[PDB]
Design a protein around this ligand. Structure first.
Ligand SMILES: O=c1ccn([C@@H]2O[C@H](COP(=O)(O)OP(=O)(O)O)[C@@H](O)[C@H]2O)c(=O)[nH]1
Ligand SMILES: O=c1ccn([C@@H]2O[C@H](COP(=O)(O)OP(=O)(O)O)[C@@H](O)[C@H]2O)c(=O)[nH]1
Ligand SMILES: O=c1ccn([C@@H]2O[C@H](COP(=O)(O)OP(=O)(O)O)[C@@H](O)[C@H]2O)c(=O)[nH]1
Ligand SMILES: O=c1ccn([C@@H]2O[C@H](COP(=O)(O)OP(=O)(O)O)[C@@H](O)[C@H]2O)c(=O)[nH]1
Ligand SMILES: OC[C@H]1O[C@H](O)[C@H](O)[C@@H](O)[C@H]1O
Ligand SMILES: OC[C@H]1O[C@H](O)[C@H](O)[C@@H](O)[C@H]1O
Ligand SMILES: [Mn+2]
Ligand SMILES: [Mn+2]
Lengths: 268, 268
């Protein structure tokens, strides 16, 4: 049992909660997690989390994993895949039941290339969704099954209020990432995207293949794989969009009125 | 090219536009049909429309089909399936290109039983979605691909503002349609539901099988197949919900403030 929905009360009066192609934009107050938890537990949903920790960024893993244990997908099956050039530096963090961690030794194109190769491996047969995040981050509040859908991106925290001409899309037509000044729905950040395994195979292959074309042509998109992620999600629109609750920098941007929760935040 | 979404402007301030399980509730101003038309034309989407016209209700077919030609899924592939006990009384309405009509001779349980049998037939191999509507209705405004999703129901026009204890669910526990007083999200009407062919196979089989159980037990649910449709959509929640724009009675209920468009309306 849970509260009845209120047809004549808006979930939010201050923000857009559904895109013009009818994908939910996920903010606090738009979902009842008790309903979603039951839906996804009935399918025994398993979520894979990829994170890269190369060179000095191995230092971020301890807090990243400790705080993921408190706030990411708790109660669901989770498998962490840590891609790193220093496997001995992976901290031994104690995980809750139903949660596992694998270390994948590596191994600008690297993240799309490596997630593409990995996403095609038969050892993911049991994993239903992949979530791909930056490591220099911590979880401060719930990040759960409300994000899961065939394909999602996350609104970049510096640009959610910006008009599209101000978005830092790739603007040179000789790049595979090019987006004209009069096109674009949102500016998505490269630091949190995901979807079903099949949709993440598709996105990461397309971005990697596009990056290889630009390399052959002697061009590097302005924001590297984030430029390619934005061209891809313009042409293949996501089935949910995460609000900046899911990707925030409090030191830079504070705690604005429209953020009811700060869920996953940058570490200085 | 089309208008950029406005992250900091709500699509509506007067109505709920997403359910608590993140299914869009489809109202005017929540979608840009130009974006959705392109998505669904890229898949060469074909929509099957079932309607029953038995006994005196054959009289409603002429306006139903004429107005469907003006307003339902125009530009997409459509196949009408008219279930009737009087095939000669089916009016010969001229259809737009890419649109076809078949007459299926029949043939309280009938609609769920007949849509179930029909939805399993291999001659639907090309049809992607089924939309199942009442015939004593006319289209007055756009009904298009914004409704298409794996499973949808429509908010009943007499009950969208009601609390759940006032919903006319089946309340006897000896019926397969039973819903307790403290359960229920919405009251859906039996006059407009649909989804992919697979989800409509599932819904109509479950409702028909439940109706056969109640018959064996000497019970008939209070509102017949609408009671069973509501029990099914409580346990298998729809992936979009249509607002009462899609199922309205202007003579009964006027043109209230929250209705920007009256799309599919009852005939007296
Ligand atoms: O438009 C809404 C309003 C609420 N909720 C969620 O449904 C649950 C209960 O909502 P309610 O506002 O009734 O909160 P309560 O006052 O009972 O604590 C919470 O998880 C809300 O975030 C939602 O998904 N959509
Ligand atoms: O030397 C590096 C640089 C980057 N990264 C990984 O790449 C992600 C994105 O890089 P960064 O945070 O510097 O860019 P943004 O902006 O996102 C980081 O979160 C790490 O997961 C890494 O592991 N080692
Ligand atoms: O929150 C919104 C606002 C608008 N639209 C749709 O996007 C298109 C353009 O919206 P706009 O309000 O900019 O209308 P305009 O003033 O350009 O006629 C129309 O189909 C709107 O219904 C939408 O899907 N969600
Ligand atoms: O004698 C009848 C009674 C009902 N119907 C069909 O069943 C639908 C639902 O019946 P009705 O409109 O009487 O109930 P509601 O309420 O929906 C009608 O729209 C018709 O499509 C029919 O064809 N002949
Ligand atoms: O430092 C440059 C990087 O900035 C972000 O982390 C962005 O998501 C990456 O694609 C890359 O452009
Ligand atoms: O007249 C009774 C009928 O009323 C509505 O049309 C309802 O959707 C049907 O299931 C049936 O109960
Ligand atoms: Mn980062
Ligand atoms: Mn009717």
């Amino acid at each position: 049992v849970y509260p009845q929905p209120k047809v004549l009360t808006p979930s939010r009066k201050d923000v857009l909660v559904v895109t013009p192609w009818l994908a939910p934009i996920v903010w606090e107050g738009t979902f009842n997690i008790d309903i979603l938890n039951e839906q996804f537990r009935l399918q025994n949903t398993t979520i894979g989390l990829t994170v890269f920790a190369i060179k000095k960024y191995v230092a971020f893993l301890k807090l990243f994993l400790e705080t993921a244990e408190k706030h990411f997908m708790v109660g669901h099956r989770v498998h962490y895949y840590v891609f790193t050039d220093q496997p001995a530096a992976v901290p031994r963090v104690t995980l809750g039941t139903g949660r596992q961690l694998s270390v994948l030794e590596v191994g600008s194109m690297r993240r799309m290339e490596m997630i593409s190769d990995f996403s095609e491996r038969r050892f993911l047969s049991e994993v239903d969704y992949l979530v791909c995040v930056d490591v220099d981050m911590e979880f401060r509040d719930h990040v759960g099954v409300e994000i899961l859908t065939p394909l999602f991106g996350t609104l970049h925290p510096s640009f959610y209020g910006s008009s599209r001409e101000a978005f830092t899309y790739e603007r040179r037509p000789q790049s595979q990432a090019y987006i004209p000044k009069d096109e674009g729905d949102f500016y998505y950040m490269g630091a949190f995207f995901g979807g079903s395994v099949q949709e993440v195979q598709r996105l990461t292959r397309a971005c990697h293949q596009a990056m290889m074309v630009d390399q052959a042509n002697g061009i590097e998109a302005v924001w590297h794989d984030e430029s390619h992620l934005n061209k891809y999600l313009l042409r293949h629109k996501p089935t949910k969009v995460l609000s900046p609750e899911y990707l925030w920098d409090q030191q830079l941007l504070g705690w604005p009125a429209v953020l009811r929760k700060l869920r996953f935040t940058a570490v200085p």
